Amino acid sequence: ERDFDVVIVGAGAAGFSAAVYAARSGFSVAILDKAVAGGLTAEAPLVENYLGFKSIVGSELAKLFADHAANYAKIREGVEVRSIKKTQGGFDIETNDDTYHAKYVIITTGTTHKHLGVKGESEYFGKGTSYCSTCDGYLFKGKRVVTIGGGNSGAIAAISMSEYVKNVTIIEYMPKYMCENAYVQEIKKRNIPYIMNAQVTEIVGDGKKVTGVKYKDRTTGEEKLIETDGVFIYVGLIPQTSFLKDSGVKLDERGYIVVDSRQRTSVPGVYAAGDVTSGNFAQIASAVGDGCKAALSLYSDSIS
Amino acid sequence: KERDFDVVIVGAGAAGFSAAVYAARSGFSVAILDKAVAGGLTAEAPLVENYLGFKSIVGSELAKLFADHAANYAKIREGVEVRSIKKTQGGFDIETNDDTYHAKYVIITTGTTHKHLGVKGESEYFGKGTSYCSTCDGYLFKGKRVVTIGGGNSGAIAAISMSEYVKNVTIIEYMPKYMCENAYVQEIKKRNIPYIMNAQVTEIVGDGKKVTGVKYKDRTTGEEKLIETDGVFIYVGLIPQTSFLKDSGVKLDERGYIVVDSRQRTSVPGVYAAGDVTSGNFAQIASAVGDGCKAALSLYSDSIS
Numbered sequence: 001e002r003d004f005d006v007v008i009v010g011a012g013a014a015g016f017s018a019a020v021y022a023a024r025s026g027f028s029v030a031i032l033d034k035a036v037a038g039g040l041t042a043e044a045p046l047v048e049n050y051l052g053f054k055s056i057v058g059s060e061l062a063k064l065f066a067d068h069a070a071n072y073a074k075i076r077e078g079v080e081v082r083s084i085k086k087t088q089g090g091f092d093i094e095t096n097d098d099t100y101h102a103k104y105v106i107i108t109t110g111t112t113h114k115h116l117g118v119k120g121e122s123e124y125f126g127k128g129t130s131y132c133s134t135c136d137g138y139l140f141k142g143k144r145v146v147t148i149g150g151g152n153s154g155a156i157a158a159i160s161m162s163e164y165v166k167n168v169t170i171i172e173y174m175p176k177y178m179c180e181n182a183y184v185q186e187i188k189k190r191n192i193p194y195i196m197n198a199q200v201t202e203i204v205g206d207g208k209k210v211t212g213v214k215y216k217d218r219t220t221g222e223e224k225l226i227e228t229d230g231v232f233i234y235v236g237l238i239p240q241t242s243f244l245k246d247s248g249v250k251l252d253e254r255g256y257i258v259v260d261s262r263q264r265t266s267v268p269g270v271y272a273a274g275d276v277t278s279g280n281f282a283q284i285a286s287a288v289g290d291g292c293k294a295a296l297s298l299y300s301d302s303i304s
Numbered sequence: 305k306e307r308d309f310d311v312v313i314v315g316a317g318a319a320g321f322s323a324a325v326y327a328a329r330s331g332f333s334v335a336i337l338d339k340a341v342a343g344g345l346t347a348e349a350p351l352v353e354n355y356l357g358f359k360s361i362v363g364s365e366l367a368k369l370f371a372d373h374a375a376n377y378a379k380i381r382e383g384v385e386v387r388s389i390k391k392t393q394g395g396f397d398i399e400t401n402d403d404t405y406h407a408k409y410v411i412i413t414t415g416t417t418h419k420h421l422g423v424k425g426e427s428e429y430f431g432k433g434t435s436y437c438s439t440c441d442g443y444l445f446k447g448k449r450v451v452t453i454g455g456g457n458s459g460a461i462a463a464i465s466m467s468e469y470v471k472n473v474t475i476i477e478y479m480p481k482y483m484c485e486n487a488y489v490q491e492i493k494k495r496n497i498p499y500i501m502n503a504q505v506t507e508i509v510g511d512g513k514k515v516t517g518v519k520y521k522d523r524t525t526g527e528e529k530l531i532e533t534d535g536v537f538i539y540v541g542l543i544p545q546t547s548f549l550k551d552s553g554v555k556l557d558e559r560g561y562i563v564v565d566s567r568q569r570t571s572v573p574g575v576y577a578a579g580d581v582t583s584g585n586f587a588q589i590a591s592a593v594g595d596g597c598k599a600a601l602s603l604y605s606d607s608i609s
């Protein structure tokens with residue numbers, strides 16, 4: 001049970017979508033995830049732009065995704081892929097488990113949360129600093145929090161947290177709102193301060209817990225300190241493509257897997273879709289769509 | 305009563321709806337124009353089981369959910385048909401069958417229309433047994449004999465869905481082998497639904513008032529046979545809804561589909577497209593939603609700089 005027609009790496013929106021179509025296309029399919037299934041979708045506080053769901057908590061939506069995919073593929077949680085190399089008869093997937101064999105592969109490993117790189121970030125990790133609001137937002141009920149990064153992720157994180165924390169403050173590097181207008185309105189509606197043009201210089205605390213965050217205005221230099229209890233960091237993503245070393249699948253300057261209009265990688269038989277691919281739009285809807293494409297594109301070629 | 309919007313989306317189908325939600329959340333005033341009532345081809349899908357999140361759901365049901373979702377973000381003008389798109393200084397002029405609409409940007413999501421067989425009796429029997437939508441007219445032949453021309457995914461699921469209330473169903477595929485995904489192939493065999501292959505329909509026959517049967521010539525032996533059916537459903541292809549684009553400047557491929565880049569941009573600045581209308585599309589709700597999402601986000605991205 002380590003041999004399948006198609007092996008998909010990553011149990012997230014893209015992967016799940018690819019699975020259902022791979023199966024329905026008549027292929028035996030296996031989805032391998034280095035952790036429990038769900039992907040970043042499970043960490044989404046509230047999803048309102050996935051067609052068909054007016055408003056659904058990410059973890060809940062991820063549950064529906066997985067259960068849907070479950071009816072067509074074997075979901076192997078806890079299996080991390082470390083390499084992929086083609087062989088005359090498919091490919092070999094070296095894992096933290098054993099070794100899997102597939103004729104075709106679809107890489108849907110998404111991304112990881114980027115780090116800020118400032119004094120006190122490493123030190124206070126698990127001491128008031130977090131990269132997942134849905135995971136640790138509860139810790140700060142009735143408390144003060146600062147969200148570093150005002151993009152769509154940071155915006156909804158803070159918007160959702162403001163429901164139960166004492167107060168939320170958003171600190172954005174760019175001299176403008178980086179989150180979609182729907183969040184801009186919601187943020188202004190809940191009176192959530194959104195500090196733009198601010199560069200965080202330091203996360204500070206009492207050696208035990210976080211007590212505040214230092215940031216300076218990029219233009220005037222004015223440095224300021226704001227006291228909170230929790231600091232959540234949403235300042236970017238990183239493609240999870242490290243396991244593709246010596247695989248032959250081309251990547252762009254930032255680590256993303258380059259693919260053609262039919263989700264094909266530079267390596268015959270290997271397809272990719274989702275937040276992991278180059279130029280992706282970072283949404284569940286596009287991942288689902290592109291995961292669909294990869295699978296049908298896979299089939300299309302399978303029939304010569 | 306307004307005709308001016310930051311962005312006009314042409315076509316209220318899966319792609320248009322997704323694009324609408326995204327364009328609206330990005331701050332734009334949005335309007336979705338459809339020549340008929342909203343829903344698009346999704347509403348004619350008997351049973352959708354490959355759109356992530358819904359294990360199984362009747363097409364008409366999913367379309368409603370889509371429309372209700374989109375309505376919260378845009379104005380859906382049913383019964384308005386775009387006849388042309390012309391670029392002006394302020395953006396675009398969109399001539400319809402209900403005055404000219406104006407928009408800064410436009411997204412084309414008009415999908416496709418069903419293709420016609422082109423055989424004798426197809427016209428003269430339309431509405432008298434002939435049809436291109438089983439979800440629409442299938443229930444009429446509940447208990448009678450039927451034949452669906454075309455064994456693609458659409459035709460297949462049409463036959464599979466009807467076999468639940470009809471007498472019998474015979475598919476007639478032009479290509480030699482099965483042309484529908486494996487999931488449908490094993491459903492057909494299970495239900496014992498005949499799947500005549502390498503058959504080329506030559507005529508739809510009836511008694512002048514109602515359809516009685518269809519004649520086809522096996523592309524191999526060259527012969528010609530006949531089958532007893534009350535109703536016939538046609539799913540032999542699709543045509544891009546792009547004729548209204550004549551002289552607009554938007555590049556179409558040799559088959560009429562809009563050609564777009566990786567960011568859903570057509571050849572005309574300010575005009576984007578997504579869904580079954582785009583050349584190379586995979587003809588699924590999922591990818592339609594996905595590209596609709598991209599088009600709107602791409603449109604937003606280009607609006608700033």
Ligand SMILES: Cc1cc2nc3c(=O)[nH]c(=O)nc-3n(C[C@H](O)[C@H](O)[C@H](O)COP(=O)(O)OP(=O)(O)OC[C@H]3O[C@@H](n4cnc5c(N)ncnc54)[C@H](O)[C@@H]3O)c2cc1C
Nearest residue numbers: 010012013014034039040041081109110274275282283284
């Ligand atoms: C706070 C927040 C809010 C968001 N809100 C929205 C929203 O409202 N709307 C929206 O459309 N999107 C939203 N998103 C984004 C959305 O969640 C992502 O776009 C989507 O999850 C990407 O799907 P994916 O399948 O490409 O990858 P991911 O979901 O990132 O999944 C990749 C999977 O592969 C696994 N994996 C990685 N490397 C390996 C390996 N080497 N071997 C095996 N398995 C591996 C991972 O463990 C993971 O489960 C939000 C994200 C965040 C963080």
Ligand SMILES: Cc1cc2nc3c(=O)[nH]c(=O)nc-3n(C[C@H](O)[C@H](O)[C@H](O)COP(=O)(O)OP(=O)(O)OC[C@H]3O[C@@H](n4cnc5c(N)ncnc54)[C@H](O)[C@@H]3O)c2cc1C
Nearest residue numbers: 315317318319339344345346386414415579580587588589
């Ligand atoms: C029987 C059948 C079963 C199917 N089953 C599945 C399935 O299980 N899974 C799946 O993923 N897909 C399925 N599909 C396909 C799916 O329905 C389509 O891929 C999807 O609807 C395409 O979306 P779209 O937005 O591109 O266009 P459409 O939904 O086709 O919508 C285009 C819209 O634009 C309008 N329009 C056209 N021209 C104009 C104009 N000039 N002015 C104004 N409005 C205009 C139309 O009236 C229409 O409402 C099925 C299709 C059929 C026929």
